[PDB]
Design a protein around this ligand. Structure first.
Ligand SMILES: Nc1nc2c(ncn2[C@@H]2O[C@H](COP(=O)(O)OP(=O)(O)NP(=O)(O)O)[C@@H](O)[C@H]2O)c(=O)[nH]1
Ligand SMILES: [Mg+2]
Lengths: 206, 13, 128, 1002
């Protein structure tokens, strides 16, 4: 029950950070440019069973584009990403869309404006209208604050399964196991280090 | 002058 | 006249608090977020054993599931007055059992201290 | 093993290629990853294109052929003209033949559409290079071959679609102005023959797949073709009747008609007017008879999401809104068209009930267009009275949260909804009132009671404030409050009663005109808010405080005067009981309260009364302050008590809050604490430093040091806040600045990097902005203390110290604006660092650095220019003119700084114009390297030609020379200049660019 998802957009828009957040829950602060593509399975638990996305996280920097539209072959869904703090990334949305629907002529596509957590927003809500004539779903998202971070996958799941009432549900939680002295001083090393490495974002509300 | 409303508002809670 | 008409629960919640969970990536000397959501202490009615169960908001995916073992010890983190660090030997949030060094942060120092209280009460419940 | 296809000495094993490809596309994990890297290395081999013909003939994997065409694509678009003319003909011939043979095989044509589409696009890339000059027969031969086969005719429609896209829709970025125009004229010249084929297919064709492909190409044509092809050919009849009946063609046809509704048409011709009416009439008729009637529940249909219904309803909304925004006047006078007009709008009403945020915004934009016109245009509003009545209910029931009850999408949507609903209220005040009262009755009678529903209605009621007459407003507001009050009583339980109370205070906060005229009521409101500031239910306290300051902002005057039946201005009463009122509030909420009081106090224009109120308001923080100063001084160890640290910070934050609303009037309070505050700043600084020495850099992460630094940051913010609003700048300069600089500059310079507060830079930026002209020695001292040490923090990468990075260049920018003399006093080595720092800013992607970096460069050039012909300016040009020219060219051409193109262009144009206006007095060249008397213009032209030759060695000398001739000749016309730069950016991406392209402006 798996669907190929291609994720495209300008470099630095947050495509990889978005996926990482869904894979591990982590927020990566470093910008390490994707080279070509990185494929990651991503599973969600729904009232219609589990759905598996094979996410093709492609590169947005042209010098790292790899196979480019070659990555789009046989995609069944897609996310186009831009950065609401960078006008040029929205200006390039029609270009990514062009290259995408030439390979994938009839697939559900979500348009995402990332980084809405940033106060000085440059691509204002009233300017974002490209999705209208192209029948794309649009969401304001932030991989950093998790604002709407589940919406793109929930909408795509509903389109791919053909059930508008599909919902994410809680995976069942098995009883956890019960709890050697040969690693006592071993785990005390690792704990000392962890205690003395400050936690990040200590001003965040949580 | 709106005495009745002031009293009515004053009693909320 | 008859007209035919038209055609984890075995547990009790001892404590619930909002929290952000971190796992320590030792090879990168970096704390990494694992999930933000409701952290719960769940007491199994059949074994009376208390566990921690934490789910991420929205996706509801499990980011912590392990017994509040009596030998675990909560320690402060250098950069926070509202977090606890402790080692975990068997957490099953993501498949096979596995050990982690966790950190859990809360909205206030008061929630952090209350969590430590509840955490120790549960250890003694697990003692018997 | 898989890496064998990367060895080009051996023949290419097609079978080994197909395995690498299959493992990539259908494999997983490590295998897929390794294959991915192999395929990328293969595709990027500059000779891989030679093995494309092999792959296309002898491979059985369509993904492999696709990648072969991608390799060919790169070669055609970048190196076509470099090839021997042998290969150009050869590549063209086996792309043409490959397409013919895929079309002739009904099995391939049916099952390899991705590969055919890729092949068609590749063909189009050849046409952009070769057609029509080296392929004049392409179009006549395309038309001839269309009749000999349905599959070939269909595919030709795909080729024509892609060609139209590449020439008209996506050329602006990707080709030179000259080349784009050449191709647009070429397509325009032969479109008569293209349209004839397309129309014949549409009138006769059977194959729906051929029809759909033809209409998809028509959609692209409509972006640019003249109106005569649309209005003089009966094609509108076909689109609006025939093709609206079959669902296969209905989606594309509707998109075509949407574009037609934006065609450039003459507005004199009565017959074109009738044709525009007619195709709308036909389309609406087909929808009513073939899709759904006007009464249909489109909300339910959209929610069911059967088939393509959602896309169809989206397209219908776009069609109706587009057409009606342009042409509804055509329907408003003829009584025989009234039914069509109102049915079209009734469909829009039904579309407006769909639960889909983005679709609602599309219809809401149209409703705004309509009600605005009905509000200004005579004799129109009676036509739409029934439409508008339904719209009132739709908008009231879908009102979203205003920011006064964090989401910028919801905020924008509320304001758009408010705007439409205000127009609708003016259009019929009585109908609006009736709907709202009625909706409220059903909140009381429980039939529509709901937390969401009562919030929604209260937002709607609050949004129309200022549209009723004062008498009607008064009667309306009273009824609403009464009904809400009884509704709050009616409930039980905390949560329920809490919702209704919030909505009550929200509604009243929205009607200040009412509050202003009913003092007794306003006072009762405030005093009820004060009662709520002791309630502990989650969110009540926040609501009470937000409402308090919201009311104060609008009604402040009534708190500062003495009212009829009062012994004192009400502000005096608030202040007396402030400790009691705020005893249960969190610090943030206390500060909002004090800020609200500051707003009132600023309305008092008697100075002595204003100052008395000020010192009365600040009595509690001032007494806590005095206590701590007397202690902290007598036992500096107290500041290690995190409780005293927190107390101190909250005192300062209270001063910031009050200073925020009082501005220049805050000065007397600032004077009460100023000197001791800066002493506190020093003592806190010593402790931060002592802690970092004893514990290491990790101390900066600890709560204790973070608490200490908060003190420093709030102090800086307080001074920044006051100085940015001060009106007496003599006092700023003579009382505030010098103690400030002694307290902050040396502490910043002599702390380790991880301990320096970027807020210091921000504070200094405000000081320079407001009084920089009056403290030239003070500015020099700022530079000496922060310039070099901050630059060394941020000149190793673009990552570290992001806040210092931004504030650093904001400071240099203001200094360069207001006190340029400070840079003249720099030693030459430090001025050289200043130039390096500007160029460093160029290379940031970070917009908050790049933009200031380019503005400093521009302002610096103007500063130097203003000096006239003096030694410093002449040395500047000799040392740095070409550094700025070449650094600007680098970011213009490196493809990683496209966000700053416009300002890079401006800077470059300014630099070039200096020389071609002989505004540089000395030669820019060595006495050695050029004949004496050579003009700087000749030298500049030579320097740049040599620079670009070495930076872009694949350009011909003719290209470079023509580009520079155009560029310098156009250095007084920014738009043309920029076009010439964009043309250059296209040509550097390929080989063999036409140098005459740069004569486009000529
Ligand atoms: N403030 C903020 N920063 C974000 C957000 N999402 C991503 N970032 C940051 O943006 C930068 C780029 O992230 P990244 O995921 O690598 O973008 P990308 O689209 O994958 N780049 P590429 O296409 O080159 O692989 C990172 O520093 C990341 O932390 C966000 O939602 N808010
Ligand atoms: Mg990436």
């Amino acid at each position: 029950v798996q669907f190929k998802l291609v994720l495209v957009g300008d470099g630095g828009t947050g495509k990889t950070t978005f996926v990482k957040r869904h894979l591990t829950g982590e927020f990566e602060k470093k910008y390490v440019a994707t080279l070509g593509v990185e494929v990651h399975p991503l599973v969600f638990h729904t009232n219609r069973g589990p759905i598996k996305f094979n996410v093709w996280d492609t590169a947005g920097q042209e010098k790292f584009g790899g196979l480019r539209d070659g990555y789009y072959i046989q995609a069944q869904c897609a996310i186009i990403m831009f950065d609401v703090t960078s006008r040029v990334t929205y200006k390039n949305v029609p270009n990514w869309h062009r290259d995408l629907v030439r390979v994938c002529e009839n697939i559900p596509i979500v348009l995402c404006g990332n980084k809405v957590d940033i106060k000085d927003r440059k691509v204002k809500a009233k300017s974002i209208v490209f999705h209208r004539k192209k029948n794309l779903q649009y969401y304001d998202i932030s991989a950093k604050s998790n604002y709407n971070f589940e919406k793109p996958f929930l909408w795509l799941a509903r389109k791919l399964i053909g059930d508008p009432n599909l919902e994410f549900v809680a995976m069942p939680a098995l009883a956890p196991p019960e709890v050697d002295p040969a690693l006592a001083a071993q785990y005390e090393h690792d704990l000392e280090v962890a205690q003395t490495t400050a936690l990040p974002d200590e001003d965040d509300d949580l | 002058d709106l005495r009745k409303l002031c009293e009515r508002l004053r009693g909320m809670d | 006249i008859h007209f035919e008409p038209v055609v984890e629960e075995d547990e009790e919640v001892l404590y619930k608090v909002r929290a952000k969970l971190f796992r320590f990536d030792a090879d990168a000397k970096e704390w990494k977020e694992r999930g933000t959501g409701d952290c719960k202490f769940l007491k199994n009615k059949k074994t009376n054993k208390v566990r921690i169960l934490m789910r991420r908001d929205k996706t509801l995916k499990i980011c912590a599931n392990h017994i509040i073992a009596p030998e675990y010890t909560l320690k402060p983190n250098v950069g926070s007055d509202r977090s606890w660090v402790y080692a975990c030997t068997a957490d099953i949030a993501e498949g096979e059992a596995e050990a982690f060094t966790f950190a859990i942060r809360f909205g206030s120092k008061e929630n952090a201290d209350k969590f430590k209280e509840e955490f120790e009460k549960a250890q003694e419940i697990n003692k018997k | 093993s898989m890496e064998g296809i990367l060895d080009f000495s051996n023949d290419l094993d097609i079978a080994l290629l197909d395995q690498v490809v299959s493992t990539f596309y259908q494999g997983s994990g490590v295998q897929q990853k390794q294959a991915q890297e192999i395929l990328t290395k293969f595709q990027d081999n500059p000779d891989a294109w030679q093995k494309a013909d092999q792959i296309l003939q002898f491979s059985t994997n369509p993904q492999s052929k696709f990648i072969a065409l991608s390799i060919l694509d790169k070669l055609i678009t970048r190196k076509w003209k470099l090839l021997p003319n042998d290969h150009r003909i050869g590549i063209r011939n086996f792309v043409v033949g490959m397409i013919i043979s895929m079309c002739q095989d009904d099995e391939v044509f049916k099952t390899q559409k991705n590969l055919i589409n890729k092949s068609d696009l590749t063909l189009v890339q050849i046409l952009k290079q070769e057609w029509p000059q080296n392929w004049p027969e392409f179009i006549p031969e395309l038309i001839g071959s269309s009749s000999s086969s349905v599959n070939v005719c269909e595919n030709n429609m795909i080729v024509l679609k892609l060609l139209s896209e590449e020439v008209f829709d996506f050329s602006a970025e990707q080709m030179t102005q000259a080349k784009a125009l050449h191709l647009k004229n070429s397509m325009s010249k032969e479109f008569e023959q293209i349209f004839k084929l397309c129309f014949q297919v549409l009138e006769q064709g059977s194959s729906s797949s051929l029809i759909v492909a033809t209409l998809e190409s028509l959609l692209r044509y409509l972006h640019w073709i003249p109106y005569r092809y649309i209005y003089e050919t009966n094609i509108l009849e076909l689109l609006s009747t025939k093709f609206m009946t079959s669902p296969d063609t209905r989606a594309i046809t509707l998109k075509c008609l949407t574009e037609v509704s934006n065609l450039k048409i003459p507005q004199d011709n009565d017959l074109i007017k009738r044709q525009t009416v007619l195709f709308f009439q036909n389309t609406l008729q087909q929808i009513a008879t073939s899709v759904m009637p006007v009464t249909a529940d489109l909300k339910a249909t959209y929610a069911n999401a059967n088939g393509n219904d959602q896309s169809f309803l989206q397209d219908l909304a776009m069609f109706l809104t587009t057409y009606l925004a342009r042409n509804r006047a055509l329907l408003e006078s003829d009584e025989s068209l009234r039914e069509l007009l109102l049915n079209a709008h009734q469909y829009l009403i039904q579309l407006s009930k769909i639960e889909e945020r983005e679709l609602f915004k599309t219809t809401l934009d149209y409703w705004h267009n309509l009600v605005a016109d009905l509000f200004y245009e005579p004799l129109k509003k009676h036509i739409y009275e029934e439409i508008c009545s339904q719209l009132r209910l739709v908008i009231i029931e879908n009102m979203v949260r205003p920011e006064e009850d964090k989401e910028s999408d919801t905020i924008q949507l509320y304001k758009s909804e408010r705007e439409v609903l205000v127009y609708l209220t003016h259009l019929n005040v009585i109908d609006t009132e009736e709907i709202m009262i009625s909706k409220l009755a059903r909140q009381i009678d429980g039939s529509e009671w709901s937390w969401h529903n009562i919030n929604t209605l209260s937002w709607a009621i609050g949004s129309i404030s200022g549209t009723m007459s004062e008498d009607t407003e008064k009667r309306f507001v009273v009824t609403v409050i009464k009904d809400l009050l009884g509704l709050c009583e009616q409930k039980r339980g905390k949560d329920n009663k809490a919702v209704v109370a919030s909505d009550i205070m929200y509604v009243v906060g929205q009607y200040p005109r009412f509050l202003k005229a009913h003092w007794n009521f306003l006072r009762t409101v405030i005093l009820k808010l004060f009662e709520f500031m002791h309630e502990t239910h989650e969110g009540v306290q926040d609501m009470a405080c937000d409402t308090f300051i919201k009311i104060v902002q609008k009604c402040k005057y009534h708190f500062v005067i003495q009212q009829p039946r009062e012994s004192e201005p009400f502000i005096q009463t608030i202040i007396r009981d402030i400790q009691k009122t705020t005893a249960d509030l969190q610090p943030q909420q206390v500060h909002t309260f004090y800020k609200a009081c500051g707003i009132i106090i600023s309305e008092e224009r008697s100075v002595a009364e204003r100052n008395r109120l000020l010192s009365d308001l600040m009595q509690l923080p001032n007494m806590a302050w005095d206590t701590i100063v007397e202690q902290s001084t007598a036992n500096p160890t107290l500041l290690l008590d995190s409780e005293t640290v927190k107390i101190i910070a909250n005192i300062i934050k209270t001063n910031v809050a009050v200073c925020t609303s009082m501005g220049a009037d805050f000065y007397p309070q600032l004077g009460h604490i100023y000197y001791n505050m800066l002493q506190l700043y020093r003592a806190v600084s010593s402790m931060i430093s002592a802690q970092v020495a004893a514990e290491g850099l990790i101390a900066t992460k600890t709560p204790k040091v973070r608490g200490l630094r908060t003190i420093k940051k709030e102090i800086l913010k307080l001074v920044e806040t006051y100085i940015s609003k001060a009106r007496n700048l003599d006092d700023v300069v003579k009382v505030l600045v010098e103690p400030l600089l002694n307290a902050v500059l040396e502490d910043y310079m002599n702390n380790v990097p991880d301990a320096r507060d970027a807020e210091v830079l921000n504070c200094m930026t405000t000081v320079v902005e407001k009084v920089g002209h009056m403290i030239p020695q003070g500015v020099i001292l700022i530079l000496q203390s922060v310039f070099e040490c901050t630059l060394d923090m941020i000149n190793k990468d673009f990552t570290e110290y992001p806040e210092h990075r931004v504030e650093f260049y904001k400071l240099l920018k203001v200094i360069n604006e207001k006190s340029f003399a400070a840079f003249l006093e720099l030693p030459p080595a430090a001025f050289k660092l200043f130039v390096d720092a500007i160029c460093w800013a160029f290379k940031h992607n970070n917009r908050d650095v790049e933009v200031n970096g380019l503005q400093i460069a521009l302002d610096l050039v103007k500063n130097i220019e203003r000096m006239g012909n003096v030694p410093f300016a002449n040395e500047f040009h000799k040392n740095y003119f070409f550094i700025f020219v070449s650094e600007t060219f680098f970011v213009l051409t490196d493809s990683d700084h496209k966000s700053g193109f416009s300002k890079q262009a401006l800077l470059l144009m300014k630099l070039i114009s200096l020389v071609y206006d002989n505004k540089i007095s000395v030669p820019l060249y060595q006495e050695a390297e050029v004949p004496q008397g050579t003009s700087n213009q000749v030298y500049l032209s030579q320097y740049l030609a040599n620079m670009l030759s070495n930076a872009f060695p694949h350009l011909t000398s003719e290209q470079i020379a023509s580009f520079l001739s155009a560029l310098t000749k156009q250095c007084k016309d920014l738009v043309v200049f920029k076009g010439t730069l964009r043309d250059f950016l296209v040509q550097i991406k390929e080989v063999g660019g036409d140098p005459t392209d740069y004569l486009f402006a000529e």
